[model samples]
Target chain A: VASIKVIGIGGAGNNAVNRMIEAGVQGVEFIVANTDAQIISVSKSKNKIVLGKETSKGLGAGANPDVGRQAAIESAEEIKDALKGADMVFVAAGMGGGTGTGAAPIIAKLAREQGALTVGIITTPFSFEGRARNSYAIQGTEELRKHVDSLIIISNDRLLEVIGGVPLKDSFKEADNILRQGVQTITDLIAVPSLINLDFADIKTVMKNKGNALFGIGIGSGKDKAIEAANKAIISPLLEASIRGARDAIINVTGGNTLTLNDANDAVDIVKQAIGGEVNIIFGTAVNEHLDDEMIVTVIATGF
Target chain B: VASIKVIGIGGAGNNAVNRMIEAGVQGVEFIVANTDAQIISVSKSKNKIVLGKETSKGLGAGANPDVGRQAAIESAEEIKDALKGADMVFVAAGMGGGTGTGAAPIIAKLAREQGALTVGIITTPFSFEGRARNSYAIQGTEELRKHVDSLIIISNDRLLEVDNILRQGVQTITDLIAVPSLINLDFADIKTVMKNKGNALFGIGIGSGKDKAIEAANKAIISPLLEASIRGARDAIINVTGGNTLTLNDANDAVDIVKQAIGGEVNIIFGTAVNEHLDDEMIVTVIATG
Candidate 1:
């Protein structure tokens, strides 16, 4: 089993891991870090890091990434142990917030410095959050991209369309769900023996020092479900990238026996061609009979 | 992508690879090898190794493993190119059969010598196939085991309990190597369990409904190919397949049931992955080292 760790930075990140814990994910350790002393103190996770204790004085970054960065720099030593022993480390946060925007990159960089394969799972702000926050989100995510193996960007503007019919109040929670899924799925990918097994080494090779990544998941049923799912996943509102610029990718197909070998091929092929056929790609297929007639396709485009 | 090669030695082995191809399994290249030229010429595989051409004049091994051995040695020079450059190699055959009995081990040994991680998937004979034939199979499998990283054995006697033994046996082993699970088992795990250890009691079971997790566990533990119970095995790996709806509780519930079947402080490696097509059912594939 690979030693996996997920570090939640700021409020958005903390809640993401919180949802994962509630969902009962196994074989992973969690840590919550925040510039706000109150959030750090009340974190449900066993491991908590109080960033910027001196800089923020237990208050918060207050929508200011500069303070968040200062707080992270101050507490870097405190978090060394948590990221030290991890084989793989995932940093989750909301890119526009004071703590998330400022602190996430530092945490990711530190995790990498500790010799861990660092991955960032983050979200951009919605339009209503205003241009300032949106710009901060982009800046934060871009900063994070340079420090990690890969970055999975979730755009609230795009997510707004997918969850369009849902309740207005659950928007933030939905982002948490995406964060939770990102960490959980990757952890599962590395944990056990699979029919189409991928090595921790394989992932490292594919994602190693790759540029921005966009994660998309689509589920389809009925005839041509495999193609339908792959198509849907390629266009999922969660990730805005066209992926034609993707240099490398990992496409995983999940389905029951009804999902034929050809369908698995079809699904992955669609993803391959969509991502630019010349792209470096690794594929995974899981035959889970529980899906009945459904087809689930997950595509991770990297180094775009 | 790593290059994968599957070599089918003798009749049964050829059929195994043929079925795999017919199933449209991707990312693999197939080869059929035989002492009989007729078998070689008539084979569905475009890539065929005509062994014993100079020795048996392409007639056949005539149920004698010695001739089969000599034939493979003669064709060893011919098969090297095929084995070369393979990241992984699978040697399939029936241990009791003439060509498979002798040629498989040599093929596996060469594959390993060529720096490939070789795995042997072969079958022992049914009771009616004769005691001497069964005896030869054991010796053949034993030698093959010495060369391969892992060896999967299917006893035709135990297989009588299941009609589609060949498909299941081949599928189980193939899936273990080629399919990526929700949670992955690495090449190291397989070597840890099967290296130097004898045959495996590989089982694949599927179940649905509220009790789907436990149900799949039960069926896997009771798989007909399990000539011996896993009760005392030193290690076990259980891979659970279900929908994204799959929960930690259910995953644990399934592994928990399988764990109960075996005693002692066994090194159990388990992982789960979601397959969207299952809808409500789950598939569990168990590998208990024997």
Candidate 2:
């Protein structure tokens, strides 16, 4: 199992953060950046840590220009410090008024600077009400895209296509829920083990180009020697890790109902022989009853 | 034709504002918000208006963060004031570190509050070298977008696609030059005398749901009109103040012929029309043939 830290931000004028946590979601961090007592009143029910220090008192509506600017700058600095030990920091902000628009950019910039893999899943402000507000929401998102390594824009406008002329408010709800699914995908990748999970390093390798890039990885098992050979054959970890490796490699182990500890050790020895283990990379070693029964090995890897 | 205001913003450290003005761009209302210049330096620039009274005591190297904040607030206020007598305001800002990022959002926000037709063209920071400057150029843009009526994003990452492959630094040069073309396109729809040009709005009406939405419709009508209008000439001025369905996509030769005669920027304002197509009964008055 992997340790995950999830930070939740929504302090402008609503209880959006706690509403997400109240449903038994794990690894949530909260910071209420607005003075709207009505929102703060609801947020207090969840009892999460307030990462930012309290300023002059009141549930101030977040649209005030001066206060909005201060909150935005402070939220950015706060998010930067919060991400120190985190492997991945996911930012969830909805555009409308203050904290989300002002602070989100600052937090994203900090996360990139710290070398922590950062992904932002934000909601755009509603449209059709007025062009100016919708324009602001789009511009805010454009700004957020500048700092994040990769972006998945979940457009409110796109929702108009879904459900065929649905209520605008309902569309906002559906878009937010769909974006949560994107968040779930990120967490799922972090939790799975025994599979060669793609971490930040893998992500970085996939995104070195100037255009959009997507990623996927697969896993299976065989006899210790067979499994090792299978893993080696399926994955050219060499080029993926940008390391030196042998032109050819093979593995073998005899007389086993199941692959023994010794067999597993021998498999590592074979991989080491093929790709001199001097390079830094992580590998998962697991039991393989099927591999022991089949007594064969296989691996494959590709990316653009 | 259409009255356009372009403000150039940069920091004490960079020459971004200078570069735009150096390219012969003019600002109708010039504002130097929260910039630190030698007391003597402040007096030198033409049409330079001070938002606040201060000579930089050299407190900060990056555009004074406090000044950036104040500059944005004040500039937004100024833009609000400028919109009263104007039909439309076009704001252009390079998404760099200091004043533009800080002030651009404020100005866009103010323009909307004033009810002036606001159109924005924002440029993103260069990727490779700017990667270090660690400026959340995206954030600055988002801040501004939260308020503008229409925004067109130009990526530094994609600038090379528009420039010639043979030229070494054409990408950078085009990056700056792209602004004039964008502004020209924006003003193309807001003129007086009208002609029926090819139906470009027809393409935008399809496939796209809301990426650009209304602006997409505005684009569908504007691009082809400007293209057909400026087929051979290097300069033209088009002023379209009001339009109806008949003017929008009426497919009239009168409109098309006049557009053919004028090959320049078309300026349209407070644009809204009845139904999908321009009404034959409606007349689109234009300055194209004036």
Candidate 3:
């Protein structure tokens, strides 16, 4: 069994990851890293690491990636220890300020060196938040890319494209939920056993790219479940890419024992049609006893 | 002089490439390739190719990427001839349609084979465009990615963030090399950073007066459309174009803002251009690669 761990960095990262845990995602360990005691104190994760005591005096990296970098360096041992024994690690953060921008790449690098396939899921600041934060986030993202197998970037503003007419706070909550779902889907796909069985190597092949990857998930029940789920994945608003010209993909379908071969074929076929004939694809199926007449499809498509 | 050609594939692609020509951008050749004769007939590009004569009968590819691919495969020779002798090529199209999604990648691949560094500037459909178009566009993008050195995807729904998005986006980038400035970022500089990199994050910010530099830097770094996608950009090239009213102080301020925004210890390359039309206004463009 693959040991999967999702580590949240900084305040925003902690909040998003914590929400996933609260939502009852199974088969994954949760960890939280932060500079402030107050922020980590509220986090429900048992595995918590406070960084940058010597540099920022544990007050936080002060919205500077440089300072954030130094703090992680100071606590590299603890980070390495946290990452030990995990088959895969996900570094989540709201980038552009302090701890997240600074430490995410460092932590990802440590995880990579520890023989784990590391992925970074980071959120970019909204346009209204000022350019400085955005720039810092971009820079941090660039740095983070160097250490992870793939980096998944989520734009806070694009959330408005899907969720309309909500308060700013609620919009952020929706954004976090979207992030949670993406993370949950990927982790579940990798950790669970499936009929066709897409494994670590297949995922790694798709993830090896120069740019950030796109992730989508869909759930449907009753009639046309496979096609419906496939459409839902393709049309998932959280999906940032247009799905053009992807060189590689890993498609996973989750269903009950009632899932038919035709149903699986229909689901995978729609994804292929949407992607065109040019891509290299690997697929898997998972039988969830809890599921009755419903099925879920998850796609982790890479190659920018 | 290094040669650069911009080819528009399909209907939406032709309009955008023509718009770039209409904007009076110099130092680049324009070409239009489409499956529809009516669309190609009206194109301003002196270099035009009407594709899919046998398949679609010159009507259109009907938004099928496969048909677009087959048409390009059939006319591979003409596509290659159109792309010949160019050091760099930009394949422009509104993806999710037959010709654009299909031929854009094939054209880009052919350009790459000819030793020309190819880049794809594509528009993805709006969310309201529905699932099928969105799916087609995504599929087209994937095909285009296989051929180009770098793919710059512009989400059409977010066009309001920047004025004249694609035309300006392409023009500003090509201008970085065409126009000589205080800090010269040549064709080699851009080719080195962009070619064959899968996809890139691009953003532009415009500002005027005292705080123009910071404002522009913020906007550019934050990305007009792509939000977090620009984060983790391994290489960043910042271009500052200002009008006669621009000052050394303004240039310095803008550069400073870009550096601070992207954070430290990454490869940073920047340049400045002064033109009369940019009077009292500054436009900052950041092209980031991961």
DockQ scores for all predicted structures:
0.01, 0.01, 0.01
Query: How far out, in Å, is residue A221 in model 3?
Result: 38
Per-residue CA lDDT of model 2 for A159-268, tens digit only, reads 23222234544432322221222112222222233333335333223222212111111222453444444344334321223213422222222223465555545554
Order of candidate numbers by TM-score, starting with the best: 1, 3, 2
Candidate 3 stretches with Cα past 4 Å from truth are A165-304, B1-290
Tens-digit lDDT track of model 2 for B1-290: 23334443443212333333333333233333334343214432343433333332322214223445575564444545545554344455556545556666666566656654554555564332122122456676666666655444444443322211011111111111222221222222211211222111101121122222233333323332221333333222222212232233333333344344443553322222222233223222221221
lDDT digits (tens) for residues A139-245 of candidate 3 = 98888888876555656565443233354334323322332233334334555545565454454456533344566677889988888888888766546676657
Question: Candidate 2: misplaced stretches above 4 Å?
Answer: A1-3, A11-16, A27-38, A44-57, A64-66, A75-78, A160-304, B1-290
Worst 10 residues of 2 chain A by lDDT: A209-218
lDDT of 1: 0.70
lDDT by residue (B112-216, candidate 1, tens digit) is 888776656666664433333576788897788788765545454533331222222223322344455555666466446544443345566778798999899
* CA RMSD (A), model 2: 29.4
What fraction of the true interface does each of the listed models get right, in terms of native contacts kept? 0.00, 0.00, 0.01
| Model 1: CAPRI class | incorrect
Q: Can you tell me the DockQ of model 2?
A: 0.01
Worst 10 residues of 1 chain A by lDDT: A171-180
